[PDB]
Amino acid sequence: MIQEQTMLNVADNSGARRVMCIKVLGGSHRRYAGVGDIIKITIKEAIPRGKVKKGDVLKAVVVRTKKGVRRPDGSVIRFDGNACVLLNNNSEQPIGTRIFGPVTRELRSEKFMKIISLAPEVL
Amino acid sequence: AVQQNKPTRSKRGMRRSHDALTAVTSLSVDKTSGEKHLRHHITADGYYRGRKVIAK
Amino acid sequence: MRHRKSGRQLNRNSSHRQAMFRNMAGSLVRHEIIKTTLPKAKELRRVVEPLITLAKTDSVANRRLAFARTRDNEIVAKLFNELGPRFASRAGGYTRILKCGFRAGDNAPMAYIELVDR
Amino acid sequence: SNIIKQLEQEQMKQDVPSFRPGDTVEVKVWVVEGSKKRLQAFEGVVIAIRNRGLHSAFTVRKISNGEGVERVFQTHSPVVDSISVKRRGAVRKAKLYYLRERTGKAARIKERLN
Amino acid sequence: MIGLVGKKVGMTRIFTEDGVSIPVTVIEVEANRVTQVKDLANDGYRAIQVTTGAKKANRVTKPEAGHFAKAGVEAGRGLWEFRLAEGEEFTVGQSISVELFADVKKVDVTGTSKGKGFAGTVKRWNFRTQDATHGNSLSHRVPGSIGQNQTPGKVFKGKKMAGQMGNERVTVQSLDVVRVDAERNLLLVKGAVPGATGSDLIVKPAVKA
Amino acid sequence: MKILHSAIYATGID
RNA sequence: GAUGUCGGCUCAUCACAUCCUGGGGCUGAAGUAGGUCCCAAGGGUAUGGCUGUUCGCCAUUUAAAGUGGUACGCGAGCUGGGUUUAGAACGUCGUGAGACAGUUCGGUCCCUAUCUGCCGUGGGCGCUGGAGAACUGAGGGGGGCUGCUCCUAGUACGAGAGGACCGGAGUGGACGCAUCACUGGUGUUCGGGUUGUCAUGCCAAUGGCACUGCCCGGUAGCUAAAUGCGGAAGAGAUAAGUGCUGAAAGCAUCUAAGCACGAAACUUGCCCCGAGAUGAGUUCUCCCUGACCCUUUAAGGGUCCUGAAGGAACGUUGAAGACGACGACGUUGAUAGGCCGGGUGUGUAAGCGCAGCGAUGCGUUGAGCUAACCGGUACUAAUGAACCGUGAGGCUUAACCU
RNA sequence: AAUUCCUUGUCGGGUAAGUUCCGACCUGCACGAAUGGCGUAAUGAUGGCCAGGCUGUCUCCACCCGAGACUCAGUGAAAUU
RNA sequence: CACAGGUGGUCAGGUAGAGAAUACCAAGGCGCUUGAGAGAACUCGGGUGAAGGAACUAGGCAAAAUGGUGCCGUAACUUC
RNA sequence: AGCGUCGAGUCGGCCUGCGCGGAAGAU
RNA sequence: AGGACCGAACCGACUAAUGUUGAAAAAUUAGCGGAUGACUUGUGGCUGGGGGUGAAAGGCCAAUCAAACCGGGAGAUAGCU
Ligand SMILES: [K+]
Ligand SMILES: [K+]
Ligand SMILES: [K+]
Ligand SMILES: [K+]
Ligand SMILES: [K+]
Ligand SMILES: [K+]
Ligand SMILES: [K+]
Ligand SMILES: [K+]
Ligand SMILES: [K+]
Ligand SMILES: [Mg+2]
Ligand SMILES: [Mg+2]
Ligand SMILES: [Mg+2]
Ligand SMILES: [Mg+2]
Ligand SMILES: [Mg+2]
Ligand SMILES: [Mg+2]
Ligand SMILES: [Mg+2]
Ligand SMILES: [Mg+2]
Ligand SMILES: [Mg+2]
Ligand SMILES: [Mg+2]
Ligand SMILES: [Mg+2]
Ligand SMILES: [Mg+2]
Ligand SMILES: [Mg+2]
Ligand SMILES: [Mg+2]
Ligand SMILES: [Mg+2]
Ligand SMILES: [Mg+2]
Ligand SMILES: [Mg+2]
Ligand SMILES: [Mg+2]
Ligand SMILES: [Mg+2]
Ligand SMILES: [Mg+2]
Ligand SMILES: [Mg+2]
Ligand SMILES: [Mg+2]
Ligand SMILES: [Mg+2]
Ligand SMILES: [Mg+2]
Ligand SMILES: [Mg+2]
Ligand SMILES: [Mg+2]
Ligand SMILES: [Mg+2]
Ligand SMILES: [Mg+2]
Ligand SMILES: [Mg+2]
Ligand SMILES: [Mg+2]
Ligand SMILES: [Mg+2]
Ligand SMILES: [Mg+2]
Ligand SMILES: [Mg+2]
Ligand SMILES: [Mg+2]
Ligand SMILES: [Mg+2]
Ligand SMILES: [Mg+2]
Ligand SMILES: [Mg+2]
Ligand SMILES: [Mg+2]
Ligand SMILES: [Mg+2]
Ligand SMILES: [Mg+2]
Ligand SMILES: [Mg+2]
Ligand SMILES: [Mg+2]
Ligand SMILES: [Mg+2]
Ligand SMILES: [Mg+2]
Ligand SMILES: [Mg+2]
Ligand SMILES: [Mg+2]
Ligand SMILES: [Mg+2]
Ligand SMILES: [Mg+2]
Ligand SMILES: [Mg+2]
Ligand SMILES: [Mg+2]
Ligand SMILES: [Mg+2]
Ligand SMILES: [Mg+2]
Ligand SMILES: [Mg+2]
Ligand SMILES: [Mg+2]
Ligand SMILES: [Mg+2]
Ligand SMILES: [Mg+2]
Ligand SMILES: [Mg+2]
Ligand SMILES: [Mg+2]
Ligand SMILES: [Mg+2]
Ligand SMILES: [Mg+2]
Ligand SMILES: [Mg+2]
Ligand SMILES: [Mg+2]
Ligand SMILES: [Mg+2]
Ligand SMILES: [Mg+2]
Ligand SMILES: [Mg+2]
C-alpha cells in the first residue's frame, strides 16, 4: 500500500539507502502499489560510493510492505517496513547484485526471477 | 428566509387539517371492581385484572 | 443505526446512568415497590434481577461483588438474607412492572415496579 | 446457527496442539512452488490467538534476515500441515503487541517451567 | 427458467484441498409447494405461484386459508411467482426441492438489503466531504451547490440528495454454486447476498451466464 | 470587512 | 428606495466545432506507426513544484488528460489568498494636503425556508358491496469505461530492421452494488494494569473523582483498507460507407421499381420503481341471504334486530425506523426481559495456606468476571373484552340458459 | 531591494519539478549618506523560505461518547407580507 | 431581564505539591426554574483509528507532538 | 450510343417558373 | 543589582472555533503576552467643544466624535424624491 510521498528502504546493494515514491505506475488515478508493483522513485539518501546518486529518478519494485500480502487461504504476511528494489529506468532490471532481507511469493514471475534467485529467503 | 406574500386562512386550515386529535377508542372494564381504565393500565382505585396490585 | 444493540442512553452519560441505576436498585430492594418512568423500570429489570441471582448463593466473594455493585451494606445484607432465600426456587422473573398512567408535571409514562413475591 | 455449526465442525482439524501466547512454535506450510510441493518451516513467538472455532487464527512473529515478519495462520487451513510447540513462554497478556517495539535483550520472554 | 425461495442462514468458509478458502453463504431452501399455475387463457401469461415455510393457524386469515385449501397444500409464510419458460410445466400441489440447482453453475440471488435509514449525501452517493479546517464554517458533510444561478433557475429531477438508503430490492448476479446439499436442504453459493440473517432470498439460474 | 450602519457588511461592487 | 465580484472547494447539467474508445473514404497507405476528411455524445476524460492566480512553464503518469454554454454555472452551499475602506512604509509625482492601471506588511463574509424546484416518507378520498393476497405492464429511472499479457504468429508484410488484420483466453486500473466469512478500525455498555486523593471504622478488598484520570486488550453492531459481483453476449432498424440487379439515357449507373450489408449512437436485451396508467387493469380466495313504518314515493328517509370477513386500537418488540409507515408475536404464546448451558473476551479473582525481614512469589486455578452472541426455558410482561367495518350490492343494451 | 515596469532579468544552490527563498552580476524605469547610508550580538504573539519529529490537513474517511436537531406535555417570538 | 459580562478590601484547613498552580476532600454552600422519550441526516464539543505522513492549503490554519528534577554535555556568532 | 455494323432522332448553348446541396450550440 | 528569567493572582488581547433575531449592542472555550515596573488598582480632585487630552490611531471626551450633548434662531434652505 505505497502511494506518492511514501518513503521506502532499498533491499539491494545499489548504493541507495532511502527512496521516495513519486508516482504509482500502472493506470490512471491509481492510488496504491503493493508487493510486485513497479513505482517511480527518487533517491533521497545514498552511500558515498555507489552505482546510483542522490536525486536520481528511477523505477523500483516493492518487495516488502507493512500492509502485507494476502494468501488464498486468508493468511497475511506483514513486515516491519516498506522495502523496494531499484530497477533500470528502461530495461526494468535490478541494478544491484544482492538482495537484503526476505521476499514473498508474489515476485515469482518471469520478470523478477533474478530477484527471486538473489533473495536470501522467499516466504 | 421569509415569505414574500401573506399566507391565507385557507392555506392555514389546509396545513392544520392534520393537527386533529384522536380520542381513545375504548376503555377496559375491570372485572372485580368494574371501573373503567386504559387497557394494560391499573385502575384509579389500584386494581389490575381483578387484583388489587397497589393500595390506593 | 443501532442494529442489534441494547441499552438506553436516557439522555445521560455512563457515570450518571450507573449512579442512577445503583440508587434505584437500592431503593427497589429497600421498599419492594417503587414508582418511576416506564423506560427506567425496563432498564432497572436488567440490573436488579442479576443482583438477586447473585444473592441466591451466599459467599464472601458474592457479598463483596454485591457490595461493589451496590455500595450499600444494608442492601447487600437484605439481598443475601431475605430476597435470596425468597427467590431461591424462582428463576428469572423476580420483578413485575405495572403501568400506572402519566405524570402531572410532564406527560411522562409512569409505572410501578415491585417484587413478584410481595 | 445449528446448520452453520455443523458445516463448520465437519471441517475442523482434530490434531491441533494446545499453545498459548508467548510460546515459540514452528509451523509447516505447503509451498506448492511450481510443479513440486514441499514443506517450509516458520518458527517464532505467538503474539495473538483468535479462537473463533473454524475461523480461528494465530499470529507468529519472527526476526528473519534482520527483518521482522508477522504471519497470521488460519488454524484449520489445509495449507498448514503441522504446528509444534518448541518452547513455552510466561506472559500475562493474551496479546503481545508490545514486542513489536523491542529487539534483543528487551524481546526475551521468560520460560514457563510449571 | 424458474427459481426457488429460501432463507439466509449466514456466512461461513469452505476449505479446498489446495488450500483455497471460499467465503460461502448458507441458504436454507426447503420444499416449495405450488399453489397456483397460470396460463395464457385465464391469466394471459405462464407462471407458477409457490409457497414455503409454515405459518400460524391463528394468524392465517380466512381468504388465505381458503386459497391454500383450494391449492391443496399447507399454508406457508408467503407467496411468490416464477415465470415459466417454453416447454416447462408444473402441477398444483407439486413440491420442488433444492435439487433443481444440481446442474446449475451460476445463480442470481435477489433479496432486501439492510436498511440504513435516512442517510446523508456522503454515505448515500459517495460525495466528498469538504475541508475540515482552513476556515470552514458549519459546512463539512453538506452537499454543496445543487444548481445554477439561472438557466434553468431550478433543480433537476434525480438530483443526488439525502434520504432513505437500503431496505430495497437488490439482485446480485452470477454467483458460483459451491454446493447443493439435498439432504439438509442447503444451497452454498460463493460470495455475499443482500439482506440480513433470516431474510427471504430468491435464487434463480443466471441469465447473463 | 467594513460594517456599514444597520449592521450590514460592505460588499458593494466597486 | 442594492442583481456580491477573480480564484479555490463541493455539486453538477447541456452542445458537438470528438481528446480516447467505435465505424469508414482517400493517402506521397509494404507492415507497425501516421496525415486528412466523414459518421458517431454511450461511457471515460491525471497527480505534484512555482505562483492568489484562470492561464502558463516544469516533473512524472494515462487510452485520453477535449473545446465551449450554463449571471465569464454554483458565497440565503463553504473559503477569503487577489482586487476595492479606515493603519504604516518604499520608489515616484506635487510647495502641500495627498495620489499612483506601482509595490509591501495587517485588516468582522448575517439570515430559524413562506411559495416554486428537488431528495425521502405519510394522511384523505377515489377506482361503484366489502375484505386478504399474488400479478400484468402504459410509463420512468439506473448501468454502458478501459489498460496490459499470451495463443493464432515471429505468421501476413518487409531487402533487412521491424512486424500484423480477423478471432480466442487470462489478469489489472477507475467506477458502482452488496456483505461481514477472512484481514483490520471502532467498540466511554466486557476484563485487566497503574498514579493522586476521598470514602466504606480499621487490614484486606472495593467504590467516587481526576478527558473513559492514563493506558493495555476486546464481544456484538457499524464499517474499509477486506471480498463477492457488474459493464456483456444476442436481436431489430439505421448513420458514414460498401454492394447486387436495373432503366430513365440501346452504354454507364448502389436507386428511380426491388434486394443484401453496415457503429460504444436509437429500440430491446441486464437491474430497480411502477394501475392516482382517473384509460384507476388481471387472477385466486373469504364474508354478509331479517322485520316494520313514513314520504317531498326514489340510486329516499326512519325504527327494532343483527355486527360477518377484515381492519383499527392496546401491549411485548425488530438486523424496520426522525414521526408515520413496514415486519414478528400476544397464554392454543419464545415477542422482549430475566434464568440455565455454551461460546467470546480478559487473564490464574476473593478467601486460605506456604516461602521470604519485606516488597513479593507459589498452590488452590486457565481461576474469577464476562455487553449486544448462540441453543433452550413460561419465571415476568404481553387480559377476558370493547371499537370501526353490515345485512346480497344502480340503469340501459346485447348474448346465452330458462 | 519593503525601492526593478520590462521581469518568472541572467548565473549558481536548494527540489523529480521552485513566478517564492538564499548567494552573486549591475542594464539603479525611479538607492544613497541625520525627511540619515551601510553593518550589527541580544530581543519580537513581526514578514518570507527550508529541515527533523508529529500527526484525520489530506489520500478517504470509519466508529464511538455527549449537547441540539426528531416525538410527547406546558409556555410561547421574529424578520417579511 | 431572576442577563455565561463588570465590581475594591479582609480570612486562608488536610493529603500530594516549590507554590495562593493543580487533583481529591474538610467547614460551608450548591445541582445553575421546563421536563419525559427516541437514539435519522446534519450542526456543536470531544475520544480512537489500518497503510502513507503536509501529498491539504494562499499559508502546517487547526490538530497532533514536546513538557519535571538531578547529572553529563552543548555550535556559528558576540556589544563577552 | 454500343461492338464496318447499327436502324430514329441526337448534341450542346441561351432566356426562364418552381425545386436540391452549401446549412454546426448549448434546460 | 537588573524597565533581568520561568510562572499564579492582577493587567492585556496574538490565533482559531462558536455565536452573530447571541448567554453578551464586542462575549465564551482552547491556546497567547507582561507579570518590581515607562506596572496595576481603590477614593477624591483638575483640564470643556474649534475646546480639552492624546508614548499620535483623527484616537478618546457617558454604547454618539474630521468638531459631544441639550435648548433656541427654526417651519434654516432644498432648481431634488
Ligand atoms: K460521448
Ligand atoms: K440568491
Ligand atoms: K468488530
Ligand atoms: K487466589
Ligand atoms: K527605485
Ligand atoms: K547609525
Ligand atoms: K511582534
Ligand atoms: K500568564
Ligand atoms: K465644535
Ligand atoms: Mg399542524
Ligand atoms: Mg436486541
Ligand atoms: Mg431531552
Ligand atoms: Mg468520569
Ligand atoms: Mg436498518
Ligand atoms: Mg476531499
Ligand atoms: Mg463565523
Ligand atoms: Mg466546524
Ligand atoms: Mg447563490
Ligand atoms: Mg426594492
Ligand atoms: Mg459531427
Ligand atoms: Mg445502447
Ligand atoms: Mg498545474
Ligand atoms: Mg515544500
Ligand atoms: Mg460566475
Ligand atoms: Mg464552465
Ligand atoms: Mg467564489
Ligand atoms: Mg486579504
Ligand atoms: Mg492609509
Ligand atoms: Mg455564509
Ligand atoms: Mg413561488
Ligand atoms: Mg441511464
Ligand atoms: Mg469483518
Ligand atoms: Mg461475526
Ligand atoms: Mg467495564
Ligand atoms: Mg487498603
Ligand atoms: Mg466524590
Ligand atoms: Mg470534586
Ligand atoms: Mg482498549
Ligand atoms: Mg480487533
Ligand atoms: Mg444496365
Ligand atoms: Mg450496376
Ligand atoms: Mg443520444
Ligand atoms: Mg427468552
Ligand atoms: Mg482483581
Ligand atoms: Mg476464562
Ligand atoms: Mg534560478
Ligand atoms: Mg530614501
Ligand atoms: Mg533609519
Ligand atoms: Mg412542542
Ligand atoms: Mg435562571
Ligand atoms: Mg449573572
Ligand atoms: Mg477583580
Ligand atoms: Mg485551584
Ligand atoms: Mg448523537
Ligand atoms: Mg464533531
Ligand atoms: Mg485525538
Ligand atoms: Mg492513521
Ligand atoms: Mg499507525
Ligand atoms: Mg515521519
Ligand atoms: Mg503543497
Ligand atoms: Mg494542491
Ligand atoms: Mg498552530
Ligand atoms: Mg493539543
Ligand atoms: Mg438552396
Ligand atoms: Mg521582567
Ligand atoms: Mg486585534
Ligand atoms: Mg482566555
Ligand atoms: Mg519575556
Ligand atoms: Mg513571565
Ligand atoms: Mg490617516
Ligand atoms: Mg464612546
Ligand atoms: Mg463645523
Ligand atoms: Mg430665520
Ligand atoms: Mg424643514
Side-chain angles (χ1 to χ4, degrees), chain D residues 6 29 39 42 51 53 69 86-88 90 94 105-106 113:
Chain D
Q6 180 183 13
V29 291
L39 282 174
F42 190 89
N51 304 279
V69 191
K86 301 304 181 182
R87 180 181 171 272
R88 301 180 303 177
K105 298 292 186 177
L113 302 185

Side-chain angles (χ1 to χ4, degrees), chain B residues 1-16:
Chain B
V2 76
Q3 68 199 19
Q4 292 196 0
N5 291 274
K6 177 186 176 182
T8 62
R9 52 186 70 92
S10 179
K11 297 301 178 184
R12 184 182 56 191
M14 289 175 183
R15 182 184 58 251
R16 294 180 182 177

Side-chain angles (χ1 to χ4, degrees), chain C residues 1-8 14-15 17-18 22 38 42 45-46 49-50 53-54 56 60-62 64-65 67-69 71 73 90-97 99 116:
Chain C
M1 288 175 294
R2 52 146 298 274
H3 297 173
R4 311 280 287 186
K5 292 188 178 184
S6 297
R8 285 181 171 89
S14 181
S15 59
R17 280 195 301 272
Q18 190 171 356
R22 195 175 310 184
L38 183 62
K42 291 184 176 180
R45 283 191 306 170
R46 301 178 65 255
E49 302 189 0
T53 310
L54 185 66
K56 285 185 179 181
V60 178
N62 285 9
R64 291 188 177 185
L65 288 178
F67 185 65
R69 295 179 179 178
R71 302 305 297 183
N73 259 4
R90 181 177 296 268
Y94 322 107
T95 57
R96 179 185 291 103
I97 296 187
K99 290 180 281 296
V116 292

Side-chain angles (χ1 to χ4, degrees), chain B residues 35-55:
Chain B
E35 305 172 359
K36 302 175 183 178
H37 66 98
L38 290 183
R39 195 155 189 82
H40 305 96
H41 288 59
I42 68 179
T43 60
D45 198 11
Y47 290 78
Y48 181 63
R49 295 177 60 179
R51 166 203 162 194
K52 190 177 182 181
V53 288
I54 70 176

